[PDB]
Coordinates of C-alpha atoms and ligand atoms in Angstrom, one line a residue:
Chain A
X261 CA 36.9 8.3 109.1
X262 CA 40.1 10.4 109.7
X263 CA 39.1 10.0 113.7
X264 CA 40.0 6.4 114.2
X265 CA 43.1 5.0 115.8
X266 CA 45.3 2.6 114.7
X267 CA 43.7 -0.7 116.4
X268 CA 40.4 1.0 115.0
X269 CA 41.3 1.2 111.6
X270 CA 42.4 -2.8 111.5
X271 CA 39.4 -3.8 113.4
X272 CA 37.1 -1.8 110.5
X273 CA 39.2 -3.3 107.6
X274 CA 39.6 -7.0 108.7
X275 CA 35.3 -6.9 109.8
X276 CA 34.8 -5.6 106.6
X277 CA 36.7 -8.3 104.7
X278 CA 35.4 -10.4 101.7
X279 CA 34.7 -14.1 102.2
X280 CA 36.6 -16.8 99.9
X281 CA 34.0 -17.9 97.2
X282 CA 34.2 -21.0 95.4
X283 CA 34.4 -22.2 91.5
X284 CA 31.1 -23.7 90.4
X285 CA 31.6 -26.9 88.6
X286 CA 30.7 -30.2 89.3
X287 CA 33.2 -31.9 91.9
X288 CA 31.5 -35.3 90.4
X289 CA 32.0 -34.5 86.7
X290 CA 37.7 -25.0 80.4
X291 CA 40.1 -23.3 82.5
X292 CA 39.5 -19.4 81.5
X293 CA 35.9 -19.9 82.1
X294 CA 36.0 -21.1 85.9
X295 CA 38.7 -18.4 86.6
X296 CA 36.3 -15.7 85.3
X297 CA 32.7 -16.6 86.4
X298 CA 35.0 -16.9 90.1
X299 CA 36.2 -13.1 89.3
X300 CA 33.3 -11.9 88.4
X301 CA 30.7 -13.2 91.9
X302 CA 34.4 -11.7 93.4
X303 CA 34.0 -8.6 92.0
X304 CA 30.1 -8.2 93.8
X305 CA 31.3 -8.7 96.9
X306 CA 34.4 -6.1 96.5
X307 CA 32.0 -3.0 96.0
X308 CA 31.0 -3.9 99.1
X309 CA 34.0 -4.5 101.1
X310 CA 34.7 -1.0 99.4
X311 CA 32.1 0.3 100.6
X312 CA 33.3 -0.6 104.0
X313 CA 36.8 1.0 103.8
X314 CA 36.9 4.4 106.1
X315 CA 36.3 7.1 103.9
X316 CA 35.5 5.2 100.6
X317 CA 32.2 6.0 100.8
X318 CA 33.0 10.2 101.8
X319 CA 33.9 10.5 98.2
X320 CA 31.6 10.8 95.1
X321 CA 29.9 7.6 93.2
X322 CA 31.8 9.0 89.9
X323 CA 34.7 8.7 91.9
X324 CA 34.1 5.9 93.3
X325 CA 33.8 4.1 90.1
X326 CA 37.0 5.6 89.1
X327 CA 39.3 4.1 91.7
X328 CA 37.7 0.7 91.7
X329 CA 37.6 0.5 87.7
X330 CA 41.6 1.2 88.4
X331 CA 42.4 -1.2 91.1
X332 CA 39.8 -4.0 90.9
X333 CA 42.4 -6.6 89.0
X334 CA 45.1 -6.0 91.3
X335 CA 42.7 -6.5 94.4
X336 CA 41.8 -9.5 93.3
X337 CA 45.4 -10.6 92.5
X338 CA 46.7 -9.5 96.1
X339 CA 43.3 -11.5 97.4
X340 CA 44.8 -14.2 95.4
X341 CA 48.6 -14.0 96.4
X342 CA 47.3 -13.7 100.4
X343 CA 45.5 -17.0 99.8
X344 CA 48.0 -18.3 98.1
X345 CA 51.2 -17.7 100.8
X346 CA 51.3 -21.0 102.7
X347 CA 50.8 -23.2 99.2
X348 CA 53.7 -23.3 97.7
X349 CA 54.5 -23.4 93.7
X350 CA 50.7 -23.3 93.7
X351 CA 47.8 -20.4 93.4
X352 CA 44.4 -21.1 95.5
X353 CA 41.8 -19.4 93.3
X354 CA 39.3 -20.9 95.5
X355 CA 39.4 -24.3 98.1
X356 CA 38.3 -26.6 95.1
X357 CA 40.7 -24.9 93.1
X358 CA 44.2 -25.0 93.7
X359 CA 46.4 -25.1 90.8
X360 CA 50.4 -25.4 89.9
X361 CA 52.1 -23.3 87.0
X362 CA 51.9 -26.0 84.9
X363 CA 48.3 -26.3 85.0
X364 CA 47.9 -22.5 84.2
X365 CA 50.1 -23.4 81.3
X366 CA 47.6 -24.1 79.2
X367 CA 48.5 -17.7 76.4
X368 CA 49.8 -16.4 80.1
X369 CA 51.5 -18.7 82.4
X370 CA 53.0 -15.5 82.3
X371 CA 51.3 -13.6 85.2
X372 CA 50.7 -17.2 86.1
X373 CA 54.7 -17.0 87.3
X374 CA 54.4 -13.4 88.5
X375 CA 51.7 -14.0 90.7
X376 CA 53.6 -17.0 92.5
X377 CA 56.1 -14.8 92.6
X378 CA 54.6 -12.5 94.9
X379 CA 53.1 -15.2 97.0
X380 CA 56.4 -16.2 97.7
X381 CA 57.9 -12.8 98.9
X382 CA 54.7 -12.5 101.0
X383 CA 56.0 -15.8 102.8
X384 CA 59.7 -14.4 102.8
X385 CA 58.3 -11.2 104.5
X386 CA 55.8 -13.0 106.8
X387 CA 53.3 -10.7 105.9
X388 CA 50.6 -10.5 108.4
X389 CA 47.0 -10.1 107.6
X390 CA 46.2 -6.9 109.7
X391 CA 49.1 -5.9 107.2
X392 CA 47.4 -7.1 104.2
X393 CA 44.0 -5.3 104.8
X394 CA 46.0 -2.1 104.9
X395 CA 47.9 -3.2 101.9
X396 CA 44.3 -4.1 99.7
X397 CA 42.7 -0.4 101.1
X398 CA 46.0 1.0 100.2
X399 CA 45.5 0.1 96.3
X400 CA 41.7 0.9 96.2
X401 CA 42.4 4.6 97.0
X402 CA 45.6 4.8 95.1
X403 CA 45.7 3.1 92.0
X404 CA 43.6 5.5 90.7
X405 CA 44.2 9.0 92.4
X406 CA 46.9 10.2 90.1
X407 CA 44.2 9.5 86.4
X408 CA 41.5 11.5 87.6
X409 CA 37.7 21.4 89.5
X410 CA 37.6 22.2 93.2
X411 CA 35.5 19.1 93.9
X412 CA 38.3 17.0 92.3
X413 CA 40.8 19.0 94.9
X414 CA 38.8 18.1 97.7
X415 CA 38.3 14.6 96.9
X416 CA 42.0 13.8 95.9
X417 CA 42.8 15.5 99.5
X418 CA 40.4 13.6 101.2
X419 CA 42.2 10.3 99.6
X420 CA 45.3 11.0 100.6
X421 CA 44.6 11.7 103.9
X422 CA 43.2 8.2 104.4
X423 CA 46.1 6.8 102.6
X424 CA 47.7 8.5 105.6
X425 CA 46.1 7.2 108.2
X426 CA 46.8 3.9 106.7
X427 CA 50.3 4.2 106.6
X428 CA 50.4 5.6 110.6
X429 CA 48.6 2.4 111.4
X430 CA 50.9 0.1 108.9
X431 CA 53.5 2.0 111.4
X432 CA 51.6 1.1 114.7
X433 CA 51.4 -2.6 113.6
X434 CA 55.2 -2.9 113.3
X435 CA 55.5 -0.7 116.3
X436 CA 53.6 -3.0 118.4
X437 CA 55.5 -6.1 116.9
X438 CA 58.5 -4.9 118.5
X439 CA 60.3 -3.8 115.2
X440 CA 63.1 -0.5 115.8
X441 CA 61.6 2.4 113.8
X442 CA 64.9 1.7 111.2
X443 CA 62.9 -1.5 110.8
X444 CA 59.5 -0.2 110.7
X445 CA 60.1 2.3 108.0
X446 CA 62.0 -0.4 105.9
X447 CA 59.3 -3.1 106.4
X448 CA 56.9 0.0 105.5
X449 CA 59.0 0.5 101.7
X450 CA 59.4 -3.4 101.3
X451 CA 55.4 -3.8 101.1
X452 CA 55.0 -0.6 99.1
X453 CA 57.7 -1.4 96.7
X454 CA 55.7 -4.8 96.3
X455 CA 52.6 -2.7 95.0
X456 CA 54.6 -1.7 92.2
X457 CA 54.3 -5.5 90.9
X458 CA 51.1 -5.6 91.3
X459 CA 49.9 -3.0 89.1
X460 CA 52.5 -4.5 86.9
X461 CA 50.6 -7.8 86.9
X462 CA 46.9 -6.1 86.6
X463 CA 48.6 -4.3 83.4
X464 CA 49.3 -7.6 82.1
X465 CA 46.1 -9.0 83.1
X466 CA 44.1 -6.5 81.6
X467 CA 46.4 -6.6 78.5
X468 CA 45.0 -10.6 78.2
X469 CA 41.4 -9.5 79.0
X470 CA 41.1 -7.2 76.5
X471 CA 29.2 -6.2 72.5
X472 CA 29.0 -5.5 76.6
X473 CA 28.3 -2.6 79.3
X474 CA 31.2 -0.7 79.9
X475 CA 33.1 -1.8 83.4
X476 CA 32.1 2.2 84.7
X477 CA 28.2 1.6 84.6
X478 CA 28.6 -2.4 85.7
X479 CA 30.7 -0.9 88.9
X480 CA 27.9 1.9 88.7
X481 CA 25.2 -0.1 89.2
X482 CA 26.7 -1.7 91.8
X483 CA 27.9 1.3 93.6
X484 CA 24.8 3.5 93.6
X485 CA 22.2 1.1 95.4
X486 CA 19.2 2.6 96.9
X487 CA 18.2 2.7 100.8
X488 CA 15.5 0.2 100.7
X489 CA 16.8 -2.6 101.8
Chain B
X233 CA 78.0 0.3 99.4
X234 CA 76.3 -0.6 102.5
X235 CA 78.8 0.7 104.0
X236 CA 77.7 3.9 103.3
X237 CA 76.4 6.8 105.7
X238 CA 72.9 8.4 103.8
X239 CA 74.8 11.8 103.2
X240 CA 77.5 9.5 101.7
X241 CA 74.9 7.7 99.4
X242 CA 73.2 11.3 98.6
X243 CA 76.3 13.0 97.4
X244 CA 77.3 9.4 95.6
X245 CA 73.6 9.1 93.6
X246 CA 73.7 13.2 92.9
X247 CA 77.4 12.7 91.6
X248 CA 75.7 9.7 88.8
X249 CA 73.3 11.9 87.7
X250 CA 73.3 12.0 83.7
X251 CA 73.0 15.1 81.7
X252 CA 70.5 16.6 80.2
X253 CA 70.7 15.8 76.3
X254 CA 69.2 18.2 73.4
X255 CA 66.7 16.8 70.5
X256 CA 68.4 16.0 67.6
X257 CA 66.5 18.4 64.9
X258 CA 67.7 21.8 62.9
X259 CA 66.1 24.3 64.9
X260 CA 66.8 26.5 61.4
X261 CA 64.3 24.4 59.5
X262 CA 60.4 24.3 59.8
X263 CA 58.5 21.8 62.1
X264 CA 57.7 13.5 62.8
X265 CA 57.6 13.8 66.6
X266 CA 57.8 9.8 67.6
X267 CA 61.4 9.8 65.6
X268 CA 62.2 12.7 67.8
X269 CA 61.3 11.2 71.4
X270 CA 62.8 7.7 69.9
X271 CA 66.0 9.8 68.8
X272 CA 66.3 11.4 72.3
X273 CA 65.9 8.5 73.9
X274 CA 67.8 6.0 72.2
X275 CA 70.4 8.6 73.3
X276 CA 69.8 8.7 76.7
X277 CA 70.1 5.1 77.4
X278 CA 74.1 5.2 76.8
X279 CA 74.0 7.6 79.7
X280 CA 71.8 5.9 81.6
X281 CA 73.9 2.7 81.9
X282 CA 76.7 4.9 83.0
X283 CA 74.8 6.1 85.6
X284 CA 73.2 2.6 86.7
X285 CA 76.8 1.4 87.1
X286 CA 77.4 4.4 89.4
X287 CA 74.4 3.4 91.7
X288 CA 75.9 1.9 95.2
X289 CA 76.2 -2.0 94.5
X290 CA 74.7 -2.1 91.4
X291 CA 78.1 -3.6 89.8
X292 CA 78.2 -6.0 92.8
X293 CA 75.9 -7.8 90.4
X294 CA 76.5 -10.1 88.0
X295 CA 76.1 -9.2 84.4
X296 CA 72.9 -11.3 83.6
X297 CA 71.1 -9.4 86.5
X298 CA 72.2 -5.9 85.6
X299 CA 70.9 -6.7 82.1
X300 CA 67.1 -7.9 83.6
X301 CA 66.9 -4.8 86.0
X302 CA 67.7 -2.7 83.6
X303 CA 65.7 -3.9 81.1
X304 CA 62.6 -3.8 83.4
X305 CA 63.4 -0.2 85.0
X306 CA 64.5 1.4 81.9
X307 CA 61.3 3.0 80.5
X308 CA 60.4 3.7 83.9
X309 CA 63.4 5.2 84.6
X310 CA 63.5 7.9 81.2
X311 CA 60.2 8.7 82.8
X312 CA 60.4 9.9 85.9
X313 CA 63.7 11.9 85.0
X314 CA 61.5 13.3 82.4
X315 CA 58.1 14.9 85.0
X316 CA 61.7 15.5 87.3
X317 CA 62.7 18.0 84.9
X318 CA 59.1 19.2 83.7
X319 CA 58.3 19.7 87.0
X320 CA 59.2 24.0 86.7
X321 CA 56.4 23.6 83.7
X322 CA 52.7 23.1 84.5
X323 CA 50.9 21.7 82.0
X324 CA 54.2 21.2 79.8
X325 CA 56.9 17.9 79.1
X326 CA 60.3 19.0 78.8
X327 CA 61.6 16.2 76.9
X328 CA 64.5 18.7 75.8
X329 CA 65.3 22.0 77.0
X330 CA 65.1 22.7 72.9
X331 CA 62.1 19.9 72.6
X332 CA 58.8 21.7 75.1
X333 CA 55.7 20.4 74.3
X334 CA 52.0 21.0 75.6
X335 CA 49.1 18.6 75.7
X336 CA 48.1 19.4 72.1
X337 CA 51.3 18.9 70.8
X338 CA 51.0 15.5 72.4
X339 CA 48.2 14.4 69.8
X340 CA 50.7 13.5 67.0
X341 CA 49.8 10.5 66.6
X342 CA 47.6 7.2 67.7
X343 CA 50.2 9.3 72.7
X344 CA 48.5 11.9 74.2
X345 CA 47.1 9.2 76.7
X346 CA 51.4 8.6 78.3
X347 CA 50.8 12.9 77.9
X348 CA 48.6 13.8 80.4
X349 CA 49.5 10.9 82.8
X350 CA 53.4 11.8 82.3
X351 CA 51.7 16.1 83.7
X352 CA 49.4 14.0 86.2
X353 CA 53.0 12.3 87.5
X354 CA 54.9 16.2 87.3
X355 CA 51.8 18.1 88.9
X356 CA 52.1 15.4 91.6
X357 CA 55.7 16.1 92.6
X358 CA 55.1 19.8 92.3
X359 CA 52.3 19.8 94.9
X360 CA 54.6 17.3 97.1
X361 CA 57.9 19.9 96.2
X362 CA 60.2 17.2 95.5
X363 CA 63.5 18.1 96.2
X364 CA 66.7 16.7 94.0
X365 CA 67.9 14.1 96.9
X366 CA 64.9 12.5 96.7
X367 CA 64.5 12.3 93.3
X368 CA 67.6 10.3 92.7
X369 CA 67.0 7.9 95.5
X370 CA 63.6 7.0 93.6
X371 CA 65.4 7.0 90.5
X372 CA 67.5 4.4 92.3
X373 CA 65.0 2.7 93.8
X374 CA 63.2 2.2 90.4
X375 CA 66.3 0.6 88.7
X376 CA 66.9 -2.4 91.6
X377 CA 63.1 -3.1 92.7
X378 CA 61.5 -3.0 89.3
X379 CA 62.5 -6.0 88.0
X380 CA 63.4 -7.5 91.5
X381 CA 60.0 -9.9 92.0
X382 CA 61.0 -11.5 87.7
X383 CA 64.2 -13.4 88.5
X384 CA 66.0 -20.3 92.4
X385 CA 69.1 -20.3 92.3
X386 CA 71.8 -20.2 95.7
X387 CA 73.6 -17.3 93.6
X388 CA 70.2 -16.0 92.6
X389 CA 69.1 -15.6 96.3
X390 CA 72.5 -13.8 97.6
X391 CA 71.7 -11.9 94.2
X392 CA 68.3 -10.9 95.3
X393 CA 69.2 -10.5 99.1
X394 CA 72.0 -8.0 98.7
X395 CA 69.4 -5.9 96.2
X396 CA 67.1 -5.6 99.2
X397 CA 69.5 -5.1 101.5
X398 CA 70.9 -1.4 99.0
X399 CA 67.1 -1.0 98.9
X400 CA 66.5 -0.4 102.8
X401 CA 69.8 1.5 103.2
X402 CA 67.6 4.2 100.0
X403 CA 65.0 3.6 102.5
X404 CA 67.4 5.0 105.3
X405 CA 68.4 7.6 103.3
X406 CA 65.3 8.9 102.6
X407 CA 63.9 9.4 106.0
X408 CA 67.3 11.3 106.9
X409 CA 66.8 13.4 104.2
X410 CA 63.1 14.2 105.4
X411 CA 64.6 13.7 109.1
X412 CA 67.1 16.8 108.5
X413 CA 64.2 18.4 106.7
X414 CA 62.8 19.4 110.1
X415 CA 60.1 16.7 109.7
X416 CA 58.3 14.8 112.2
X417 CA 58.5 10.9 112.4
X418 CA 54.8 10.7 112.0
X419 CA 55.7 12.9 108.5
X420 CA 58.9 10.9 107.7
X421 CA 56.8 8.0 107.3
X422 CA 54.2 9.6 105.4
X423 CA 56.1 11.2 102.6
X424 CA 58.2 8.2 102.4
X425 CA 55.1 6.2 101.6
X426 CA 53.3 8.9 99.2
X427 CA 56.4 9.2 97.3
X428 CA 56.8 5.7 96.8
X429 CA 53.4 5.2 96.1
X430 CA 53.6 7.1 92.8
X431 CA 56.1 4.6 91.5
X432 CA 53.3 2.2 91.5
X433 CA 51.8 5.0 88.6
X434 CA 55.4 5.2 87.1
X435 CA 55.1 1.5 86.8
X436 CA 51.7 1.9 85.1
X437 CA 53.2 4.6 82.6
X438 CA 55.8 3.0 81.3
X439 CA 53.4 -0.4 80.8
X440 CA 51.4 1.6 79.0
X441 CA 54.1 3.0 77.3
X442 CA 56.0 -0.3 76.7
X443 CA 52.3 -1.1 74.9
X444 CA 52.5 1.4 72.1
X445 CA 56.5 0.5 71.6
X446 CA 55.2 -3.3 71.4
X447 CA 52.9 -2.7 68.5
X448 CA 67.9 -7.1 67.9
X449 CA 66.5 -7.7 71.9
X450 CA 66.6 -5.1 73.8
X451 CA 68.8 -7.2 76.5
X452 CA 71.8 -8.0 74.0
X453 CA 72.0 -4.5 73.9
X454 CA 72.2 -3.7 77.4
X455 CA 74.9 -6.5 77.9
X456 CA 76.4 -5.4 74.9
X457 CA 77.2 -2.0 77.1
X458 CA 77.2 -3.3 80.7
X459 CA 80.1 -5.2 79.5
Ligands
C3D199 O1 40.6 -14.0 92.8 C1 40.9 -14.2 91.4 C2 39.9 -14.8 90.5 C3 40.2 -14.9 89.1 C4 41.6 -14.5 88.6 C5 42.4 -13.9 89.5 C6 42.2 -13.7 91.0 C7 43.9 -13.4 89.3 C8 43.9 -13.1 87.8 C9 43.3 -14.3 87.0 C10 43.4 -13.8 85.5 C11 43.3 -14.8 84.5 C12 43.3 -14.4 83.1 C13 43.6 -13.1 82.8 C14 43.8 -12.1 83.8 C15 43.7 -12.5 85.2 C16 41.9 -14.6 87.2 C17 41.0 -13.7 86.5 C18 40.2 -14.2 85.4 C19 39.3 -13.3 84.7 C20 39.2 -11.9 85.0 O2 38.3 -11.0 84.3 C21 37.0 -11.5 84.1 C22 36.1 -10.4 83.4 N1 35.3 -9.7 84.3 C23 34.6 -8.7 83.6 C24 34.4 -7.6 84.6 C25 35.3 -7.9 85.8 C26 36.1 -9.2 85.3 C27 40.0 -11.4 86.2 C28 40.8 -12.2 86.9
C3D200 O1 63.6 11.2 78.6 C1 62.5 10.7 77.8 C2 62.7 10.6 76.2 C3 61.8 10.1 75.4 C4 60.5 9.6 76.0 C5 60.3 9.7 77.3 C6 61.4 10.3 78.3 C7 59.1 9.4 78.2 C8 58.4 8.3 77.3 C9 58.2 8.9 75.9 C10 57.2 7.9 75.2 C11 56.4 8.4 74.1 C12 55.5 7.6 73.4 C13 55.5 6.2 73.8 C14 56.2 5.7 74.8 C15 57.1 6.6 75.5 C16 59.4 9.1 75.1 C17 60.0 7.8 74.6 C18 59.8 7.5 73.2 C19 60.3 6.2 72.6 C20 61.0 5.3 73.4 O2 61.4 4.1 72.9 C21 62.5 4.2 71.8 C22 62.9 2.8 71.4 N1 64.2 2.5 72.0 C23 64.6 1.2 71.6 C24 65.5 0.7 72.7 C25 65.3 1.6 73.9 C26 64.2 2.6 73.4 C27 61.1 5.6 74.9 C28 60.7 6.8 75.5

């Protein structure tokens, strides 16, 4: 986990990427429904694209649960805002569902904005995908390091020293695409600084989405599957 | 402003730096806490657009834009100069060198919650030693990025474009500072991302935070004394 190179670390990541789900509805035949029965078949496959980020699994199921329960919203905005880059004015939730601002304005057209927003200084960056993938692992170990005994020391060392090795190969990427290191460092704060409005948009997010199971044992469940399949 | 060399833009963002103001209650007189931190920072804001109008090419703006980045970063900003301060005191927020408080003193009322993230945020710089240079350049960095991505206009892009461009030349300043620290470029690069990482938790504070204020417009106030 802490062993890999650069190239090895964006091979592992893009392999162990998600694939782009679609809404279910009839194509032959409301809004807040489709958007959440999409984010909720997402949210399966992200435990185990989690699962497949170097040194995700090295830590303990409690927490495990802790930093996904903390980051899951703005994954699946940055998801979002990645699919999203070369539409724009418009968000592609999934292929057979592409909408426009004033389509989400039918209350938060709000985030609806925001998360064009970011789509947009994606496509004014050029943000590269072997970028992103370091970007998305970047907020599943961080977003919830700092809300967490001498197990806790271990494991919050352990996290940072794959956020680390993440930032060395964010590094190597704008190494190898010929950037000066004054331009590595500063393309290195640009996409960091952009992390900020993320969490900013999952605040708002979660401020709109909130009897059922607790998101802890859902992400639980999930999370501690057995070895017999 | 961009003109500026980083040990230029150091001595510059150190020279800003507001003071350090004292709650407003009799110390005389026995032991509401809320009126006290509102008090405090009410009080703190004056200063703080004095010092926002001190940071490099933050009055090349025009008006309406210092009054949305301020209005975004401002909560963020009383926040980290508050774990910057309470940094010397584990487990403790030193709001005011007269105003100390523990976690327990946090529960006051329906708090405690911004309490133990605000020592998460302090414990963090402690264990990272944050030294004063970089604290202000995050402080800076908070007040022109924060509200930076909630702005089509042509001024609008040279707006946004020169805000970027003061943003790498922090950037710049930081890795000198960690450059003339004696670190490595594998550790410039490093520290510069941990410590902006924890702006993302900032960010999440003052949310939060900004959530428990929620339950005369804040801006008309902040142009009533940008201008
Ligand atoms: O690729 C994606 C699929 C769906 C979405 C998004 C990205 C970006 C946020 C959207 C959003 C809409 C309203 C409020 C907040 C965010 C929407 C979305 C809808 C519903 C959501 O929450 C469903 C509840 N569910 C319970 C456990 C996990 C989520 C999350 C995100
Ligand atoms: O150095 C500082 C002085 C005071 C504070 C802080 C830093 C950190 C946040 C604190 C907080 C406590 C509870 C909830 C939210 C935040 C408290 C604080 C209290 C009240 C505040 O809001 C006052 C309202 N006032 C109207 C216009 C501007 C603020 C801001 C900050």
């Amino acid at each position: 986990a802490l062993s890999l190179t650069a190239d090895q670390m964006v091979s592992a990541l893009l392999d162990a990427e998600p694939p782009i789900l679609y809404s279910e509805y009839d194509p032959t035949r409301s809004m807040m429904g489709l958007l959440t029965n999409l984010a909720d078949r997402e949210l399966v496959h992200m435990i185990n694209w989690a699962k497949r980020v170097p040194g995700f699994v090295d830590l303990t199921l409690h927490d495990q649960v802790h930093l996904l329960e903390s980051a899951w919203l703005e994954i699946l905005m940055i998801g979002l805002v990645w699919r999203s880059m070369e539409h724009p004015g418009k968000l592609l939730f999934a292929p057979n569902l592409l909408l426009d601002r004033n389509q989400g304005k039918s209350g938060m057209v709000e985030i609806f904005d925001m998360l064009l927003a970011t789509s947009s200084r994606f496509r004014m960056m050029n943000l590269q995908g072997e970028e992103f993938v370091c970007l998305k692992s970047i907020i599943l170990l961080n977003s919830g390091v700092y809300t967490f005994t001498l197990k806790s020391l271990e494991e919050k060392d352990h996290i940072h020293r794959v956020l680390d090795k993440i930032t060395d190969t964010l590094i190597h990427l704008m190494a190898k695409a010929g950037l000066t290191l004054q331009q590595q460092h500063q393309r290195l704060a640009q996409l960091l600084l952009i992390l900020s409005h993320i969490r900013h948009m999952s605040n708002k997010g979660m401020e709109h989405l909130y009897n059922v199971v607790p998101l802890s044992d859902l992400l639980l469940e999930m999370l501690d599957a057995h070895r017999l399949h």
